From a paper:
After transcription, the 3′-end is oligo-uridylylated by a terminal uridylyltransferase, [name] (TUTase6)910, one of the members of the non-canonical nucleotidyltransferases. [name] is composed of N-terminal Zn-finger, RRM, palm, fingers and KA-1 domains. The C-terminal region of [name] is a previously unidentified RNA-binding domain, and it was named the KA-1 domain. Thus, the present structural and biochemical studies have demonstrated that [name] acts as a U6 [name]-specific terminal uridylyltransferase.
Therefore, the complex structures of [name]_ΔN with either UTP or ATP soaked in were analysed. The structures of form-II [name]_ΔN with UTP and ATP soaked in were also analysed, and the structures were modelled and refined to R factors of 22.9% (Rfree of 25.7%) and 24.1% (Rfree of 28.2%) for the UTP complex and the ATP complex, using reflections up to 2.7 and 2.8 Å resolutions, respectively. In the structure of UTP-bound [name]_ΔN, one magnesium ion is coordinated by the β-γ phosphates of UTP and the catalytic Asp216 and Asp218 residues. The phosphate group of UTP forms hydrogen bonds with the Nη atom of Arg414, the Nδ atom of Asn432 and the main-chain amino-group of Asp216. The uracil base is sandwiched between Tyr432 and the side chain of Arg366. The O2 and O4 atoms of UTP form hydrogen bonds with the Nδ atom of Asn392 and the Nɛ atom of His549, respectively. The N3 atom of UTP forms a hydrogen bond with a water molecule that also hydrogen bonds with Asp543. The ribose 2′-OH of UTP forms hydrogen bonds with the Oδ atom of Asn392, thus discriminating the ribose from the deoxyribose. The structure of the [name] nucleotide-binding pocket is suitable for interactions with UTP, through specific hydrogen bonds between the uracil base and the conserved His and Asn residues in the catalytic pocket.
Numbering used by the authors: 145 to 223, 329 to 637, 763 to 792, 802 to 815, 826 to 877
The structure:
């Protein structure tokens, strides 16, 4: 791993062959599936012992065809407001207590009633496996089946999703935090494939209408109905190759307006959020930096956890990857040994790149006034020579981001023996023609956030400046808000 993978991807043909090979290398082996089935069987046996006539249903990564090595094993267990909440919560503990002291081999057990989808976390020691036991999310079964079906509908889906998943992991865009879940990322890829000029994938609405007899099903008041076999459905007339579709993903999602759009897998379309139209129907829908609607539960934004920082970093990383995707290094192979194609996408992010990709949250303000405020803070209060979404190129000959404490101390001392912007500029002027550090500053219309990226950095002091700006700029903007 991390060695074999690099040389395996370097060795093979074109980018598409690399994506396919990546699928081959990351997916679970037959032994891993054997192990998983065995553990599920154990779970099934003990829970049957406690709950006669109960079924343990595997779902998620394990059955949805997007499985990779080391992925979780998710299990659904199939057997007045606060009352029902707590009844539910009590049952969970029971399940927990069964996992804790009955089924042999599982040690880490933590009940999580406080989650949106209450679950009992567990780990099985001999198999090295770990996952979730969910009392009720029945939708998960169906959306898992939907993802597997999606892979079955077109052969480009799984390579695209695998490549983009590994890439997002490498860019710090996915995980269990404010980052996108793997499910949400997959949904985003599928959404992208739905919106192509010829569509690669159909909308879930279309699937729902195709459906079939006996294939009609509703769970929690939502319609989960779709055809069970891909055989009934006509192929895609979209002829685009894998490398193309990848580049198109990067470009497209880099150019989308995320805050103004609820991306709908049902309609295969972007529903304008402002104002209130998606918010009226489907009560319970959370809107924010990134809005991505579940194919079935329509009150569910699967991206609702994503902070503005993660969304901005997402579109930035996609813009960078789109620029790389236009390069000759991407498309064509290398003669001998060089990193080409998928490899720089799958390689870790540079510290300067990782830092510059994630934007800086700024106090709310009209776009025009905000831009003017920022250029004021750069022009004066900082020694920056600046010049002309919005963007500016800035040049510094000095250490201005550091040494400010001693300088202000000395100036206030001269004030002993002897309000923002210009005052702070004093602090700048007392800190002292090839620019020491030169960088770019960008502001996107919605939501307003500043992207600072390095241009000329001889001494590698850009990150210090970036942290400094992270602290200093919201402060400056803030005081410029209160001068009105
Ligand atoms: O918002 C969500 C998230 C997850 N899920 C359901 O839970 C499952 C878990 O989705 P995950 O985001 O955990 O990804 P995954 O399991 O497919 O891959 P690993 O994280 O195991 O590497 C998904 O397959 C989906 O069915 C939802 O229904 N809604
Ligand atoms: Cl597009
Ligand atoms: Mg998982």
């Amino acid at each position: 791993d991390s060695h074999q993978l690099a040389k395996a991807l370097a060795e093979a043909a074109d980018v598409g062959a690399q994506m396919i090979k990546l699928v081959g290398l990351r997916e679970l082996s037959e032994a891993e599936r054997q192990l998983r089935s065995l553990v599920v069987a154990l779970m099934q046996e003990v829970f049957t012992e406690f709950f006669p006539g109960c079924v343990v249903h595997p779902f998620g990564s394990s059955i949805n065809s997007f499985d990779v090595h080391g992925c979780d094993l998710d299990l659904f267990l199939d057997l007045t407001p606060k009352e029902e909440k707590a009844e539910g919560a009590a049952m969970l503990e029971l399940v927990g207590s069964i996992l804790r002291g009955c089924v042999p081999g599982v040690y880490r057990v933590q009940t999580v009633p406080s989650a949106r989808r209450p679950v009992v976390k567990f780990a099985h020691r001999p198999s090295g496996l770990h996952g979730d036991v969910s009392l009720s999310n029945r939708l998960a079964l169906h959306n898992s089946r939907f993802l597997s079906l999606a892979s079955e509908l077109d052969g480009r889906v799984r390579p695209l999703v695998y490549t983009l998943r590994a890439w997002a992991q490498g860019r710090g865009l996915s995980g269990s935090g404010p980052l996108l879940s793997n499910y949400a990322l997959t949904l985003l890829v599928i959404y992208f494939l739905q919106t192509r000029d010829p569509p690669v994938l159909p909308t879930v609405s279309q699937l729902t209408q195709k459906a079939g007899e006996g294939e009609q099903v509703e769970v929690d008041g939502w319609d989960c109905s779709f055809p069970r076999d891909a055989s009934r459905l006509e192929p895609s007339i979209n002829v685009e190759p894998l490398s193309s579709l990848l580049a198109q993903f990067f470009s497209a999602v880099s150019s989308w307006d995320l805050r103004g759009s609820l991306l709908s897998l049902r309609e295969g379309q972007a529903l304008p959020v402002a104002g209130g139209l998606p918010s009226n129907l489907w009560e319970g829908l959370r809107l924010g930096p990134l809005n991505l609607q579940d194919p079935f539960d329509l009150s569910h934004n699967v991206a609702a956890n994503v902070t503005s920082r993660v969304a901005g970093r997402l579109q930035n990383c996609c813009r960078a990857a789109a620029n790389y995707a236009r390069s000759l290094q991407y498309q064509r192979r290398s003669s001998r040994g060089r990193d080409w194609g998928l490899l720089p996408l799958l390689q870790p992010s540079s510290p300067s790149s990782l830092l510059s990709a994630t934007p800086i949250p700024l106090p709310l303000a009209p776009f025009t006034q905000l831009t003017a405020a920022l250029v004021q803070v750069f022009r004066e209060a900082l020694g920056c020579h600046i010049e002309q979404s919005a963007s500016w190129r800035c040049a510094l000959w000095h250490r201005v981001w550091q040494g400010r404490r001693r300088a202000r101390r000395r100036l206030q001392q001269q004030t002993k023996e002897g309000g923002w912007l210009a005052t702070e500029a004093q602090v700048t002027q007392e800190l002292k023609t090839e620019p020491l550090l030169s960088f770019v500053a960008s502001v996107s219309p919605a939501d307003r956030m500043l992207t600072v990226t390095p241009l000329q950095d001889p001494q590698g002091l850009f990150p210090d400046l970036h942290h400094f700006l992270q602290v200093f700029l919201p402060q400056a903007i803030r005081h410029l808000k209160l001068e009105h």
